[PDB]
Amino acid sequence: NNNIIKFDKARFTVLTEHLIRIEYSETGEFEERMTQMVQNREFSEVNFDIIEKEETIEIITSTVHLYYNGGEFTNASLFADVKFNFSVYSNRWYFGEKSDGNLKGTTRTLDMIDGECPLEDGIMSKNGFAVLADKGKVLTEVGDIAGNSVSTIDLYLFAYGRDYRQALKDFYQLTGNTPKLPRFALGNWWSRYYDYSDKSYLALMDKFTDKKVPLSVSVIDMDWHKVSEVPSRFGSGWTGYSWNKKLFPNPENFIDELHQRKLKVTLNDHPADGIRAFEDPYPQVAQTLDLNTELEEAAKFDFDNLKFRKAYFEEVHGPLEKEGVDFWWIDWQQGAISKSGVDPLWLLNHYQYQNAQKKHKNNIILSRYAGPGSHRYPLGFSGASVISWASLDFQPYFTSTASNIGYTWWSHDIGGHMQGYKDAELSLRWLQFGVFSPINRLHSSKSEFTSKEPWHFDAVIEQSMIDFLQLRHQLIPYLYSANLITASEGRALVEPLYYEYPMEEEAYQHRNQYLFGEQLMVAPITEKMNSLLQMGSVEVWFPEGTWYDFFSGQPYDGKVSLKVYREITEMPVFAKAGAIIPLDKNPLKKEEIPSEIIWKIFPGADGEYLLLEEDNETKAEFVNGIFTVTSKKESSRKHTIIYGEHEIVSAKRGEFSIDLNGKEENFDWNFSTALFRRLDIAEISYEQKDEILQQLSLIEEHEKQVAFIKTNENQELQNSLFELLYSGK
Amino acid sequence: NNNIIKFDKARFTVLTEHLIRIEYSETGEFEERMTQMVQNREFSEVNFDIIEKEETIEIITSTVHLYYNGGEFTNASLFADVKFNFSVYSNRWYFGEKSDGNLKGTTRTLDMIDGECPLEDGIMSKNGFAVLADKGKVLTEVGDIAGNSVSTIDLYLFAYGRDYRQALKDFYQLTGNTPKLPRFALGNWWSRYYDYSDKSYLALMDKFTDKKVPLSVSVIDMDWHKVSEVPSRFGSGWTGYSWNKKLFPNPENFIDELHQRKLKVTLNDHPADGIRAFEDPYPQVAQTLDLNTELEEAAKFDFDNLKFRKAYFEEVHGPLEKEGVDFWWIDWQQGAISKSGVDPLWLLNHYQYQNAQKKHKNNIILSRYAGPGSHRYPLGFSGASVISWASLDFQPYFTSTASNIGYTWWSHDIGGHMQGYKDAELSLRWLQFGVFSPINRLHSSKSEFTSKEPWHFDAVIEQSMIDFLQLRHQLIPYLYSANLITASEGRALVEPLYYEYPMEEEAYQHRNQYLFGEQLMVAPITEKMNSLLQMGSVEVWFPEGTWYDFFSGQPYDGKVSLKVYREITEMPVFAKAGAIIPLDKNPLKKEEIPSEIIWKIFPGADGEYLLLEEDNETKAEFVNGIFTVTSKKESSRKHTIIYGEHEIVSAKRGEFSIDLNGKEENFDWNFSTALFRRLDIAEISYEQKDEILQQLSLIEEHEKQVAFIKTNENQELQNSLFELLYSGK
Ligand SMILES: *[C@]1(O[C@@H]2[C@@H](O)[C@@H](O)O[C@H](CO)[C@H]2O)O[C@H](CO)[C@@H](O)[C@H](O[C@H]2O[C@H](CO)[C@@H](O)[C@H](O)[C@H]2O)[C@H]1O
Ligand SMILES: *[C@]1(O[C@@H]2[C@@H](O)[C@@H](O)O[C@H](CO)[C@H]2O)O[C@H](CO)[C@@H](O)[C@H](O[C@H]2O[C@H](CO)[C@@H](O)[C@H](O)[C@H]2O)[C@H]1O
């Protein structure tokens, strides 16, 4: 109440020094209930100043002057000056107007998108302020829609400057934290829009095992249910709740077989045509909803309706869950229309996520983005992207930017969904990105030609895809720990560079570069390789410090912007001196938590990593060359230590300390080996290869080696050779 | 009343199983009067089902579920599911929203359009439903504007699936059938924006006769009236009702001369500046309308005003009609503004078409499209197209698509109106299309360089244009019979392929291909010829069956999509085995109905043709090789029979039967002659011509002749040779 100020028909709540709620009420009553967006307005007390006159009020915090001159809210009556100098004259908010600087957020879907699409604003701005309008309905205490707010205007002014992480934390305090994901969500998912039988689906799952590809999730797409068998008088077979008995004669037994293989099972649900008279559950639903069965009255989709929702969860989903379905893929594409004015997609995500908690702890959905606050209902499902280099090139930027509206669990169709064109290299680059994305779900539309099975491709592509898919399971400990940090501390797994480096202009100029947890920096390659080099490339910004390629140990002295080149089988991922990354030593081994962890240490600085698990916390410390591992609880877990290049300790039990000061710090990576490899794969003249190898071996002074490559007629070859020289300086 | 259901403030009329009127009234009174669009709501009783509850109503027909949940009509309150599966999730109509699938209709005009323009929706959809909003004013019983409907929302839900012909028939039952055209409308029209005198206009008409070009209509454009002679204080000379006496010293005598030549006469009327004080009829109009003549008060155009309309028809048009003007070219381009909110173009077409019936039976106008229902006022006048290949390439698609809103008598300026560029081949291809279009009106803007006279061009173009212009008059019996079928059965002369072949995807992929009556399929060439081939081309979809080129007898086995090549003098027109096409044997002969008919029979199947005339019906039957001609009434008419290639019977009177089983079925058309001609005109190397002729003569097996042409370095030459091989298979 000390942090609440009324003036004329407005109410101002100073939630933090940098977050002010702004309300208008014609009725003099202001809204206390939660909304679709807002779950909590309880914040600790803060200091601020007021200048209140007859006709005007000014609220003053450490970061903003908010002015209200009375009357209806207009661009003239309600406005704010930030106490920052990030811009020369973009430091003022005017009610109902847009200002420059917004770093954007996300959008509902990538359905039908070939490359870039427009995004909605987020809460982050380079100029230090953003306004988030609450246009949603009020909730009841139990979380049903209650109707219109009595605050007919309800806004949140964010004035955090470039303290982006704190803005996001306080956003999560206002809108509710992201829930914890279950560990199974972080493994590889198999999905394909393909009319598998029980037999061919299990045969494929057993082929994954034979091929050494680990999976956590078995998606079954819409051909699980009747499609062509639906009489046309009912409409299409898009919506379905009845097994196709030719393909799945015993569904519970088939799901039992996936459960024996330690897979979680989800089915595609297209809800929009509801429960029509041909469906297996229709007799029960018709009885519950008092439908006219002799006129074959449909139970039309109506998620505003309590009785419909109950029948949907209990009598439609319920029997399928009893057969063993673990969680729901809500695949909604039929618009934003409802009686209530609430988006049916929001109603589905809110009510289905809540219903999923009844049968499994920390359960998920898979569904499209439903607006600010819908991060409460993971996972995000971006949908039917066009298969193209342009779509891949948009996706890292899309994924990191989404953290700016707190939606940090986007699952993209890895390799793209539909249409587009075949290029095995595009498929491989997309999988590299997916492995370093929130969720790694392989999926494809209905084409005989778009399977994401590694063995679809040639032996080189296949082996690389298998390697990356195994790496995803090696990363599950790191991902799961980051997941618990999202849930408990409001930190995104994927951060734009500018979260960590807000004052570095280069942190705003590398759209596809991101931080992946706290220990890794990713620069995916999203452009087709230069055939003369047989290598793809990306311009990488290296912050201040010593950086190592995560895979090769190639070093880079920051701060620098440097074009980096990789073969199609290799991905630019970097770790700082002192980085500690845990890996599952046994990624193929079915076990709910790893029996063995590899501690991968990057020499040259102190470091620390906290491994959060379901029932433990394990701290790895690297201080003055001493590596120490301690846990809250004891276990039989065996620890492996890799210090730079070399395995130091193999499968050691319990807590321990070891001195690595007397151990080889340097990786093997060396200029001459790397130079020989780049020249050898290049589709260039042998006389050019001979001369470059000879001259770069003979010329001793680094500045003269660089002068020699500066004369090369191949401009991209110059850049590739320059990367090696820079790493070898 | 059994087919009428009221619920809340709505009224639902089930007109057919597939056509439901949807009304809202705030006052509880619903509209029974006709509207600008709707002339008849009397339909035979149909069966349907209702589910009526406290708060909701569902109407169920064989093809649609219409739902209304009460309150104001919104996208949430009023919606419909079709009982079809043409799409996966585009089977629902939402009030006020657009869905995918609409096959489009037409637009007001092609004025100033170079190629394509956007079209309005029609009543046809690939997904099986369309909504046609009635936003017009109510009429009185006699057909004057009465003001606003009491049904403040008035919609027609069409749910015909892909039964397009039935949708159009029922549209014509709702909006009124197209009236019969007079036979004279179906012949060639001469028009040119050029300042002819009486003498030079008659000299040109006599030159047409000398050149063996038949004409039905003599258009006189705006230089008939005063133009430069109008004092500038009155504004421009665009509007005029006073003969230029230098050019037309005795108008009645000049119109008498056109009447002696068996021409119908129309004048251009630009109505928008009304009757100003310099006009010949102004003294009479001023007296009737009580104008201030000493202040030279204009009788401004006001078609909302009963007295203005009367003075316009009786005192302005009346004297010109007494001089012999047969019908009015209404040339309105001055906007959609009126006191009433009724488009002045609609007021002109409605009232002028009605007034034209006073002096001639089945009279016409010539005017732009005035919205749904304005098919009641033929003919359509598309206006000032840009002269270009792009404009020609749009026009067949434009013409057939218009049938989807029932506007089936579009008259285009043949050869294009204005601007654009000279290409004698474009002029010739445009005339080919015009001859197989609803109306063949040659017209051109004010340029010394754009006359459509055949003898404007070189001897090759001239002779081809004369041949096509004579063909149009040969087709008048077929056109006039189709005209009576439009008027009596609601079948368009020009149909998109998908009317006949709604389930064939290829019927939606050949935009410029159409059915022309029931016996002919047209694929106009609308792209400049390939100079290497000296031939133009179009990809033709041949439906199942045996097809013949109408002109050459070249055969084609359906179903196939095949690129076809024609010299600039030849047009792709096709007839099925069993086709019977009547032709006027004496197209140059002035006679109100043909004294001789050629029955052109395509061998290989049974067929039938009904020739409807002013005062007769003649049935031609081809059954098990027996051709029979019978008529309702006897006449002196002499019948000629052409069976494939050969004239069997010459000028035989009365009813008769003849056996053609013992007569040569095969056309002369042959691979070797056609191959020699294509190679001979081609601007390619003689060594290539020599080798193709030699190899295609020597190689006996059809598959190896195709393999030989597959090696040709000229890709289009491959396609041309492949067409011949396919026809010769
Ligand atoms: C894609 O699906 C279409 C189907 O609609 C149908 O036409 O069959 C086609 C194959 O011949 C198939 O390509 O396109 C639609 C329209 O854009 C999408 O809605 C589909 O994506 C969604 O549904 C899929 C099936 O459940 C699912 O795998 C996707 O993840 C969904 O986004 C798309 O596959
Ligand atoms: C064309 O007419 C213009 C005239 O407006 C005037 O400027 O003289 C020009 C020649 O030097 C002439 O080209 O352009 C206008 C504006 O777009 C159209 O309205 C004219 O078309 C209509 O009027 C014509 C004359 O009656 C008629 O032949 C057309 O059929 C009408 O559409 C167009 O000719």
UniProtKB/TrEMBL annotation, chains A, B:
<keyword id="KW-0326">Glycosidase</keyword>
<dbReference type="InterPro" id="IPR000322">
    <property type="entry name" value="Glyco_hydro_31_TIM"/>
</dbReference>
<keyword id="KW-0378">Hydrolase</keyword>
<feature type="domain" description="Glycosyl hydrolase family 31 C-terminal">
    <location>
        <begin position="491"/>
        <end position="581"/>
    </location>
</feature>
<feature type="domain" description="Glycoside hydrolase family 31 TIM barrel">
    <location>
        <begin position="179"/>
        <end position="482"/>
    </location>
</feature>
<dbReference type="Pfam" id="PF21365">
    <property type="entry name" value="Glyco_hydro_31_3rd"/>
</dbReference>
<dbReference type="InterPro" id="IPR051816">
    <property type="entry name" value="Glycosyl_Hydrolase_31"/>
</dbReference>
<dbReference type="InterPro" id="IPR017853">
    <property type="entry name" value="GH"/>
</dbReference>
<dbReference type="GO" id="GO:0004553">
    <property type="term" value="F:hydrolase activity, hydrolyzing O-glycosyl compounds"/>
</dbReference>
<comment type="similarity">
    <text>Belongs to the glycosyl hydrolase 31 family.</text>
</comment>
<dbReference type="InterPro" id="IPR048395">
    <property type="entry name" value="Glyco_hydro_31_C"/>
</dbReference>
<dbReference type="Pfam" id="PF01055">
    <property type="entry name" value="Glyco_hydro_31_2nd"/>
</dbReference>
<dbReference type="GO" id="GO:0005975">
    <property type="term" value="P:carbohydrate metabolic process"/>
</dbReference>
<dbReference type="InterPro" id="IPR013780">
    <property type="entry name" value="Glyco_hydro_b"/>
</dbReference>
<protein>
    <submittedName>
        <fullName>Alpha-xylosidase</fullName>
        <ecNumber>3.2.1.-</ecNumber>
    </submittedName>
</protein>
